[PDB]
Design an enzyme around this catalytic site. Sequence first.
Site, short mmCIF file in Angstrom:
data_model
loop_
_atom_site.label_atom_id
_atom_site.label_comp_id
_atom_site.label_asym_id
_atom_site.label_seq_id
_atom_site.Cartn_x
_atom_site.Cartn_y
_atom_site.Cartn_z
N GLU A 128 0.78 -1.27 0.00
CA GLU A 128 0.00 0.00 0.00
C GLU A 128 0.80 1.30 0.00
O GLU A 128 0.58 2.15 0.83
CB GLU A 128 -0.98 -0.01 1.17
CG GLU A 128 -2.07 -1.03 0.98
CD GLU A 128 -2.87 -1.28 2.22
OE1 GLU A 128 -3.02 -0.34 3.04
OE2 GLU A 128 -3.35 -2.43 2.38
N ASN A 170 2.09 -5.37 -2.87
CA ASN A 170 0.66 -5.66 -2.62
C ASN A 170 -0.12 -4.36 -2.37
O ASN A 170 0.34 -3.47 -1.63
CB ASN A 170 0.53 -6.62 -1.41
CG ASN A 170 -0.90 -7.19 -1.22
OD1 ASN A 170 -1.42 -7.94 -2.05
ND2 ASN A 170 -1.50 -6.89 -0.08
N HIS A 207 -10.53 -6.18 -3.12
CA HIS A 207 -11.71 -5.83 -2.32
C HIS A 207 -12.74 -5.20 -3.24
O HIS A 207 -12.67 -4.02 -3.49
CB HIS A 207 -11.37 -4.83 -1.18
CG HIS A 207 -10.44 -5.38 -0.14
ND1 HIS A 207 -10.71 -6.54 0.58
CD2 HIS A 207 -9.23 -4.94 0.30
CE1 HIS A 207 -9.71 -6.77 1.42
NE2 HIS A 207 -8.80 -5.82 1.27
N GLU A 236 -6.49 -10.62 -1.14
CA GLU A 236 -7.47 -10.31 -0.11
C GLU A 236 -8.91 -10.25 -0.61
O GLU A 236 -9.68 -9.40 -0.19
CB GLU A 236 -7.06 -9.01 0.59
CG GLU A 236 -5.63 -9.04 1.12
CD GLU A 236 -5.27 -7.77 1.86
OE1 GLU A 236 -6.20 -7.00 2.18
OE2 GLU A 236 -4.06 -7.55 2.12
N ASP A 238 -12.66 -10.13 -1.43
CA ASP A 238 -14.03 -10.18 -0.91
C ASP A 238 -14.92 -9.26 -1.74
O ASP A 238 -14.44 -8.30 -2.36
CB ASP A 238 -14.14 -9.88 0.60
CG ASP A 238 -13.29 -8.73 1.04
OD1 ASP A 238 -13.24 -7.72 0.34
OD2 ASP A 238 -12.64 -8.74 2.12
O1 LIG Z 1 -7.01 -7.14 10.39
C1 LIG Z 1 -8.03 -6.48 9.70
C2 LIG Z 1 -7.59 -6.09 8.30
O2 LIG Z 1 -7.37 -7.29 7.61
C3 LIG Z 1 -8.64 -5.24 7.61
O3 LIG Z 1 -8.07 -4.73 6.38
C4 LIG Z 1 -9.00 -4.13 5.50
C5 LIG Z 1 -8.48 -4.26 4.07
O4 LIG Z 1 -9.21 -3.45 3.16
C6 LIG Z 1 -9.24 -2.12 3.45
O5 LIG Z 1 -9.85 -1.36 2.42
C7 LIG Z 1 -10.02 -1.99 4.71
O6 LIG Z 1 -10.24 -0.63 5.00
C8 LIG Z 1 -9.19 -2.65 5.81
O7 LIG Z 1 -9.82 -2.45 7.06
O8 LIG Z 1 -9.07 -4.23 8.42
C9 LIG Z 1 -9.47 -4.55 9.75
C10 LIG Z 1 -8.31 -5.23 10.47
O9 LIG Z 1 -8.59 -5.63 11.79
#
Ligand SMILES: O[C@@H]1[C@@H](O)[C@H](O[C@@H]2CO[C@@H](O)[C@H](O)[C@H]2O)OC[C@H]1O
Length: 301
Positions: A128, A170, A207, A236, A238
């Site tokens: 990021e 990433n 995401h 990641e 979803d």
């Molecule tokens: O551990 C958790 C993270 O895996 C989670 O990460 C998310 C990834 O996408 C982003 O756009 C989200 O804003 C971000 O929160 O976040 C919560 C944390 O506890």
Amino acid sequence: AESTLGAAAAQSGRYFGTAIASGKLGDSAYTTIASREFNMVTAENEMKIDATEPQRGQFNFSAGDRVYNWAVQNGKQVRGHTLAWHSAQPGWMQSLSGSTLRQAMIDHINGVMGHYKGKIAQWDVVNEAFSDDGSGGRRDSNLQRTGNDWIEVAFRTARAADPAAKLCYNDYNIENWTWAKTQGVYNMVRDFKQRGVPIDCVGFQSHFNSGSPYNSNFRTTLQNFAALGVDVAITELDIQGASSSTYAAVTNDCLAVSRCLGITVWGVRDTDSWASGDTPLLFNGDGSKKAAYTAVLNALN
Ligand SMILES: O[C@@H]1[C@@H](O)[C@H](O[C@@H]2CO[C@@H](O)[C@H](O)[C@H]2O)OC[C@H]1O
Ligand SMILES: O[C@@H]1[C@@H](O)[C@H](O[C@@H]2CO[C@@H](O)[C@H](O)[C@H]2O)OC[C@H]1O
């Protein structure tokens, strides 16, 4: 085999992964599904910088190792997440700048990779680093303020630290081919490949939701980064509302790109998601399969 997500992906040379939270490993419904379906594990939090080096110069691998050990004991590989990031820094690191900070970055990479040496399939070395301001440029962190070469040095360090592991950059919101952030990263990786900076892979967090919708140019993105001479991974995944269409679309995108190593969804059930309210994963709080589960499995088969 055929019956589970990881086995099916394995037929075509790939993996199907999940994020694991150590805090949920005492829940047998969680570990039954996790253990059964996935052949790759990422630690959702336990390898972040503040989890592994919360005190300057002293490392802490307990929660890390609990996830590493659970994965190995149940036959999965591991992705490391993550070695150099603007966010989740301890206060001591947050307080440094310039070459002191750069040197802490190198030491952190070496301590953590050294501990898991030879045991990690892929590492998110840098996570990021690009802005969400539409410019395409780098983010303005403390890490950037040491010099633009910080990313390059991160990757060179990581290569020396554990030659066995694939090294990933990433990020999120780099899935849409026409958007500026994507092109900024694409331009960087291309520059790296021209000059022999050791980047093995690019990670597309993937995401998908209302602020960053799926778009079928995702395939074009994957193909384009692949031609640069790197592997690509969905790290990641979803999807807001978990449409079956869209879960199958993402899967077939990966299956169309031969340098696409695999798919990781970010959590085991809807209730374990960072966005639980969006029910964006493949299992309900019950533990029962959702419709997207079947679509992912068919595409894999
Ligand atoms: O551990 C958790 C993270 O895996 C989670 O990460 C998310 C990834 O996408 C982003 O756009 C989200 O804003 C971000 O929160 O976040 C919560 C944390 O506890
Ligand atoms: O931040 C990025 C969004 O800006 C991007 O937005 C899409 C761009 O083209 C528009 O015509 C689409 O409707 C819009 O959703 O999507 C990806 C996201 O990462």
